[PDB]
Design a binder for this molecule. Structure first.
Ligand SMILES: O=C(O)Cc1c[nH]c2ccc(O)cc12
Ligand SMILES: O=C(O)Cc1c[nH]c2ccc(O)cc12
Lengths: 259, 257
């Protein structure tokens, strides 16, 4: 029914779930509680136009983009804190540690960003705001499409119906890759992930009995992430040329470099 | 064991062997221990056309261009082998005709590189039913954009072949790839996903029974699907950049491709 074996993997599930709660202020559970309206005090102020973008504080395209940019830098921070708590992660070559974060941080950001989205928009400013997909798609030329592929992924991905205890493990599997470019020590990294994969596989089986092969369906979604990430950097480089007065955060510049 | 899955597995394996001339097992014997004609440079390629007489892709009345053309001729040839295998997958044929076309259209490039891996090692790849072996370096030896056409694939193969899968495994892995419900333009996704789910259980059992030793191999293999997509898009980009050189006379040839 559950031997020494699984028992250890559950202990790992719990451990990761706990660090996740402790590292990310806005879990999917809270995100969805705000979005479904199962509240009165948790309801968000909606921004669907310039008019409301104004009241919402109580050119824009860039004021918004740069808003995402720094929020993004903040996520790299929360994720880096989460990584450290991944058994074995800190025991690796400090170089490989940086490499895993370099390539992993964004795929993780979009995985989690889905938790704040629904087909119509996304929660912002810690859930207090809600920016609609349409207002975002209406931004001037370039910026009008930087969020669209995120919604794309989010709708398909949210369909898997995963909760925080699931994501916590899935997000760890993402960091502990190994096929990541320039890793010095691949075996050590692969020994961790193999362990994380069993954790997720069991976690999903127990958490979603009625959902068969969800493990594989979740694993296949990683292709979507890479594509998303690539597309982002690409749209990112273009903007760099069009808007030369707009900066980019150093940290963020170090992640996209040689990426 | 759900004999139903152990069945779908043998079925798929049986079809894989009938649809594909050169198998992973066959190709691993050559690479290791009637040796193929080795093509390591320009002169060896020359004698190769008269020897290997792989002149099915060449008689068409520029070394880097005749090589690239040659790969495409094989690619087309493979597409038919894949299309035939596809029809062996339980239920594939019963799908909406358009969706069957859609699945094959977006899966062929992924399956080709997946199987191309079977024919290559870190130092080269097997060509023409395995009669040849074009070295990997003579391929970087190519100028223009032709010097990085295959390189991204040797890299993929090295990571992929490391999984040490065999034809019984690849047979199911490929079925899974074709049955991808995220192909743009599909009309009725449910059927395709149900079948893929079904194919996923078979590949899972296949790998646990065939590779008890390797932990989570199923999971690791699925991950390779990422590198595959990346390999394909990147490849499609090359075919774009290459579209700036030139283009029985061509008119009809350019059409077949
Ligand atoms: O990827 C980046 O560095 C910037 C970025 C663009 N759009 C986003 C939406 C949410 C988020 O957290 C960050 C971003
Ligand atoms: O629900 C998730 O997967 C986590 C998540 C996504 N976006 C966020 C922005 C801020 C924050 O504290 C947490 C999150």
């Amino acid at each position: 029914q559950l031997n020494p074996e699984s028992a250890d993997l559950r202990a790992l599930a719990k451990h990761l779930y706990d660090s996740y709660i402790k590292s990310f202020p806005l879990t999917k559970a809270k995100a969805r509680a705000i979005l479904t309206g199962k509240t009165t005090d948790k309801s968000p102020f909606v921004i669907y136009d310039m008019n409301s973008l104004m009241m919402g504080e109580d050119e824009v395209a860039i004021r918004i983009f740069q808003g995402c940019q720094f929020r993004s830098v903040e996520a790299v921070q929360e994720i880096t804190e989460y990584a450290k708590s991944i058994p074995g992660f800190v025991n690796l070559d400090l170089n490989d540690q940086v490499t895993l974060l370099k390539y992993g941080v964004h795929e993780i950001i979009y995985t989690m960003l889905a938790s704040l989205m629904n087909k119509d928009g996304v929660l912002i400013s810690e859930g207090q705001g809600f920016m609609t997909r349409e207002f975002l798609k209406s931004l001037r030329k370039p910026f009008g499409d930087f969020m669209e592929p995120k919604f794309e992924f989010a709708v398909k991905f949210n369909a898997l119906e995963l909760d925080d205890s699931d994501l916590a493990i899935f997000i760890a599997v993402i960091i502990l890759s190994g096929d990541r470019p320039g890793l010095l020590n691949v075996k050590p990294i692969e020994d961790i992930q193999d362990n994380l994969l069993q954790a997720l596989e069991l976690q999903l089986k127990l958490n979603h009995p009625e959902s068969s092969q969800l493990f594989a369906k979740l694993l296949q979604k990683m292709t979507d992430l890479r594509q998303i990430v690539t597309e982002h950097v690409q749209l990112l480089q273009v903007i760099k040329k069009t808007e030369t007065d707009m900066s980019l955060h150093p940290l963020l510049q170090e992640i996209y470099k040689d990426l």
